[PDB]
């Protein structure tokens, strides 16, 4: 079903999946609706997997009266935050829930108020990458990555980049409005074609070393 082409090899992996085994770190969290942010979000998007997420607050109070029970230690996240919290991954954890039209429809986003696993360290992680300069770019083995915030000004966002997309860049040619992820490398080769607003090429998924 749906297979109209035959290729010579299998894809190495899918976005949001671990491609190598080694040291790793992850934490759970609860997704907050993007509309809840007070200064409003200049950049918007869905809660797509393999996108960066930011810390929003603590939701461990679990009570309504004068005394409250601190039952668990939980964290609450938003699609784009100045403070980096992790990258959503491990798609096998969640449920499809179908879509608005009909069930059994391919969906790759999580609803608001749902749980998730976010990665701070990973030897090998397959994520989708983006081009932030609207021009042809070849990354090569050793590079740096960055993610779009919600508070990114429209003047610095001429391209319609999503809320929490990941952008690769060279050592000294970082875009003006992005937030860098320390000690992050591409550790793989990839090439991207020319880019323009409204015709944003989604790039190609690529291996990436978080820490």
């Amino acid at each position: 079903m749906f297979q109209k082409q035959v290729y010579r090899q299998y894809t190495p992996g899918f976005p949001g999946d671990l491609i190598e085994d080694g040291p790793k770190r992850a934490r759970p969290g609860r997704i907050m609706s993007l509309s809840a942010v007070n200064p409003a979000a200049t950049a918007t998007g869905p809660n797509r997997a393999s996108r960066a997420f930011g810390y929003a607050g603590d939701v461990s109070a679990l009570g309504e009266g004068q005394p409250k029970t601190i039952a668990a230690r939980a964290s609450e996240v938003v699609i784009g935050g100045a403070n980096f919290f992790g990258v959503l991954g491990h798609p096998k954890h969640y449920a499809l829930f179908g879509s608005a039209g009909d069930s059994l429809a391919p969906s790759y986003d999580l609803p608001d108020g749902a749980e998730g696993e976010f990665f701070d360290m990973a030897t090998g992680l397959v994520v989708e990458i983006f081009n932030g300069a609207a021009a042809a770019l070849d990354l090569d083995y050793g590079d740096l990555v960055a993610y779009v915030p919600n508070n990114l000004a429209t003047a610095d966002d001429a391209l319609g980049l999503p809320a929490g997309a990941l952008v690769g860049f060279k050592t000294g040619s970082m875009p003006t409005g992005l937030v860098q992820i320390p000690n992050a490398r591409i550790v793989n080769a990839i090439s991207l074609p020319a880019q323009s607003a409204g015709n944003l090429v989604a790039g190609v998924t690529i291996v990436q070393l978080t820490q």
Binding site: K24, A26, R27, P28, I70, A71, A72, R73, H93, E115
Partner: protein, 53 residues
């Protein structure tokens, strides 16, 4: 005397999530012993005189 004081809290489950841990902290309490004394002394003439009553 001693105390135990356990500690620990839980988080939501995840396949690749880190593992929370529990611990404890013991303390000790002390009290001090206090001693007292008291004496008496009787003389020969006063003992005989007091026997008159």
């Amino acid at each position: 005397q001693g105390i135990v004081e356990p500690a620990g809290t839980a988080v939501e489950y995840g396949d690749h999530t880190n593992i929370p841990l529990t611990s404890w902290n013991a303390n000790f309490e002390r009290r001090t012993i206090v001693r007292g004394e008291l004496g008496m002394m009787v003389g020969t003439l006063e003992e005989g005189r007091a026997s008159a009553i």
